């Protein structure tokens, strides 16, 4: 099932959305994240995203709700289609491969400046076939591990 380290890591991920640290993710905090991922969702779109995770319908996402989704979806095998959306966030030029520069771009936008050596290490870790880049199959493994 879900391990105690997965719980801790899902909580760290939650806290990166929950930027004022009040224990609930608002549409406003969700907006901040989506924009740093290169998107610009409207208020209606932000509220409808909240609907996906907000189980009691109070308009925000608390950690138990966030955890319920993360834990349930990881047991799923039918998230290919969502991972494909996640892929396109990284693959900015749309060429089917995530480059070092594309990886660093997304990482620095989320609040992490990495050296050219650190980005290379991440690509190297994910790169199974050796083209020095990340295709979809390799990206699945880096979102699924």
């Amino acid at each position: 099932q879900l391990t105690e380290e997965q719980i801790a890591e899902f909580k760290e991920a939650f806290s990166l959305f929950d930027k004022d640290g009040d224990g609930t993710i608002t549409t406003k905090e969700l907006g901040t994240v989506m924009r740093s991922l290169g998107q610009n969702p409207t208020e209606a779109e932000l509220q409808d995203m909240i609907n996906e995770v907000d189980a009691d319908g109070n308009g925000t996402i608390d950690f138990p709700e966030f955890l319920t989704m993360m834990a349930r979806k990881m047991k799923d095998t039918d998230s290919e289609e969502e991972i494909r959306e996640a892929f396109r966030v990284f693959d900015k030029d749309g060429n089917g491969y995530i480059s070092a520069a594309e990886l660093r771009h997304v990482m620095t936008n989320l609040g992490e400046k990495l050296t050219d050596e650190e980005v290379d290490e991440m690509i190297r870790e994910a790169d199974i076939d050796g083209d020095g880049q990340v295709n979809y199959e390799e990206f699945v493994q880096m979102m699924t591990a």
Binding site: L16, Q39, E52, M70, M143
Partner: peptide
């Protein structure tokens, strides 16, 4: 879109760590 963002944020933090 939201779950994609959640997976990404998880990857991001664990990349930092």
């Amino acid at each position: 879109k939201i779950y994609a963002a959640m997976m990404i944020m998880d990857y991001y933090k664990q990349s930092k760590v």
